[PDB]
Amino acid sequence: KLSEEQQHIIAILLDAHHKTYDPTYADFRDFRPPVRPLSMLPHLADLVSYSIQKVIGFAKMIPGFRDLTSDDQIVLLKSSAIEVIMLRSNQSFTMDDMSWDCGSQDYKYDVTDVSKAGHTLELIEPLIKFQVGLKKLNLHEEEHVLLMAICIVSPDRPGVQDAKLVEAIQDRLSNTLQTYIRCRHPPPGSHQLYAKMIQKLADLRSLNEEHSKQYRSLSFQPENSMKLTPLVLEVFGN
Amino acid sequence: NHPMLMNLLK
Ligand SMILES: [C]C1=C(O[C][C][C]C([O])=O)[C]=[C]C(C2345B678B9%10%11B6%12%13B96%14B%109%15B%1172B932B437B%126(B%13835)C%14%1527C2=[C][C]=C(C([O])(C(F)(F)F)C(F)(F)F)[C]=[C]2)=[C]1
DSSP: OOOHHHHHHHHHHHHHHHHHOOTTOGGGGGSOOOOOOOTTHHHHHHHHHHHHHHHHHHHHTSTTGGGSOHHHHHHHHHHHHHHHHHHHHTTTEETTTTEEEOSSSTTEEOHHHHHTTTOOHHHHHHHHHHHHHHHHTOOOHHHHHHHHHHHHSOTTSTTOSOHHHHHHHHHHHHHHHHHHHHHHSOTTTTTTHHHHHHHHHHHHHHHHHHHHHHHHHHHHSHHHHTTSOHHHHHHHOO | OOHHHHHHHO
16 A cells, blocks of 8 residues: 555656756757767766766655765765766656657767767676666656666665665665555566666666776876866766 | 755755
């Protein structure tokens, strides 16, 4: 039985996502232009920096997130940012040509664009496999926003101080998701869906680790760091 | 330390 509180949580997270995800991609006009030599790094750095801002806006609305300390909020957002950005991007991902389609040919990104921002197949191949496996789950929007929120509020992130409180907040979201699947996701799509969604969170930890490796090699070169944004430098490191 | 993160969180 989906309790009234659990329905409330889902409503909050759906609204938070709708307030922090613009499916018209209007703000892409503001980014440095894509050029198709790490020719896509300025554009995709701007895209990521933009997405970081939106992920923070979503995080602030997760029930219980505001009850954490400032330090724990920062630690969770720093460690989860690239994972939530990858999850968030799955909305625009299409399996029809394995690309992130953001409304325009100019704003349609394939594996070549990603390598033109400085990343390598060590990241890109598992990243495509993730996007495909996530897309095949055909998540309800309710489950998509719950998974983003569970990803953010993870008690085993490095540098978490109040792990017991983070865990208490995550457990409320996890039980909401488990009960939503049981009561609202019909079979056969519901089959071991919770375990499959948690497996995706495990995949994101591995993607996070490889992204940070490649980011460090990328940003170690000052010529590359010059093309990043100040927010990206603060979040992913200097 | 994290002034832009902290400002976007307020
Ligand atoms: C959320 C979102 C999105 O969403 C819909 C449209 C936006 C919206 O409306 O939200 C669409 C597309 C992306 C993606 B997909 B995956 B591919 B890879 B990850 B995800 B972002 B960017 B490329 B595209 C990617 C990326 C680029 C740059 C780096 C860097 O490592 C660097 F630039 F290469 F250095 C960085 F430093 F991190 F930027 C890391 C990751 C993210």
